[PDB]
């Protein structure tokens, strides 16, 4: 559980993502693929690493990370109360495209050090502590649901 205060903290900063939803998901992808390609495996192959500016080119890599960082707003909104909107997400995360919660942890990953990088201002310690623990949450309750469909990834 966050307190209140955790919870304003988290969706604080992340108004600043909602002022450029497509930048801040470009960033936070690039930085998923670079840090770890392995995940680009579970997108058609290219699973080469192009370059940064190839990546920041791509209409579907923006598109990627506008639909990543919407459904995780709504998310985020939730403050833990998110049941209906982590239901249609585990299905899709577990069955079709088989995202281990080792994946998830990686793209949280990507998301605090975009955020850190962006907004130093609004991501001193206690607010990156919130947001690690919002992330925790998620993927604490989407792996108890991938276990509910069978996936133990
Ligand atoms: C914060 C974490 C994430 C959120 C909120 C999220 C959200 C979404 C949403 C809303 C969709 C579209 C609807 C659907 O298929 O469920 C989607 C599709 C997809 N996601 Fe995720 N995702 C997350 C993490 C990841 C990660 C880490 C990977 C891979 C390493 C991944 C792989 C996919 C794939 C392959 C698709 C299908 C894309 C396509 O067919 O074009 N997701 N995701
Ligand atoms: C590969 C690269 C190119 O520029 O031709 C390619 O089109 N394959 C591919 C990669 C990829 C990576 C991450 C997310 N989504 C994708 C793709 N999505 C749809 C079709 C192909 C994709
Ligand atoms: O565009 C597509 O049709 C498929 C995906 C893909 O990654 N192609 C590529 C394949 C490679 C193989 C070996 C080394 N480098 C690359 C490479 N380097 C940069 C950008 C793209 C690629």
Redesign the pocket.
Known sequence: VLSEGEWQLVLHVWAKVEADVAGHGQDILIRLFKSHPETLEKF????????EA?MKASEDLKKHGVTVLTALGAILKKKGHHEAELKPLAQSHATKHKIPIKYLEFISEAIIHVLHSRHPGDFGADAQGAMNKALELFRKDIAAKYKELGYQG
């Open positions: 058609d192959r290219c699973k080469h690493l192009k370059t190839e």
